[PDB]
């Protein structure tokens, strides 16, 4: 808060800050925020006369339990549901439903968090960056799930199993990944 006068200047009035800190006397506690310190200073510019200023700084902490209990827990929830479409077998028909639904919920929380945040480009919050990372990861999960669902429905009458998938995806990797038929 910058208090100064528009009529007079430093050559005609002083402006003496009395106490170093603003008092906290009739203060009602806000419930959402916490005042932690309230310093105040008097700004004058050398080699620039006719300048007076009294500024008060309010450094304010947040009581964070509301946005924690309403946004951080569903964030880690829908992120935890994203490395989970691969344990589901392709013999069932419910993979693409789960993948599209996880991407839908992530875009929903991104559009929700872009509303309570200010529209500035200093830096995105860590929630928005985290959801962007997880959203690109879920899109790669969709394209590799379609690729792994194409190879499930390959019949002997229409395809020929090449020798390189014979030597790679049948012998080496089921021993490398502890599968063992």
């Amino acid at each position: 808060l910058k208090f100064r006068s528009w009529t007079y200047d430093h050559t005609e009035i002083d402006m003496v800050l009395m106490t170093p800190t603003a008092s906290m006397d009739d203060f009602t506690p806000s419930g959402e925020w916490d005042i932690v310190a309230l310093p105040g200073r008097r700004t004058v510019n050398p080699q620039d006369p006719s300048y007076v200023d009294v500024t008060y700084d309010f450094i304010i902490k947040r009581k964070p339990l509301f946005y924690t209990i309403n946004l951080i827990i569903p964030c880690v929830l829908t992120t935890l549901l994203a490395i989970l479409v691969f344990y589901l077998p392709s013999d069932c028909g419910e993979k693409m439903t789960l993948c599209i639904s996880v991407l839908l919920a992530l875009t929903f929380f991104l559009l929700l968090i872009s509303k309570i945040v200010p529209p500035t480009s200093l830096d995105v919050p860590l929630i928005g960056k985290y959801l962007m990372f997880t959203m690109v990861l879920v899109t790669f999960s969709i394209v590799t799930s379609v690729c792994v669902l194409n190879v499930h429905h390959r019949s002997p009458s229409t395809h020929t199993m090449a020798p390189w998938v014979k030597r790679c995806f049948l012998h080496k990797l089921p021993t490398f990944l502890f599968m063992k038929r």
């Binding site: 344990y87 860590l126 997880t134």
Partner: peptide, 20 residues
């Protein structure tokens, strides 16, 4: 295979983001 790959990448991603 892609389960293990994306699990490892997601764990390193969470660590690298929430390092501070």
């Amino acid at each position: 295979l892609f389960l293990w790959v994306f699990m490892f990448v997601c764990v390193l991603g969470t660590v690298g983001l929430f390092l501070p």
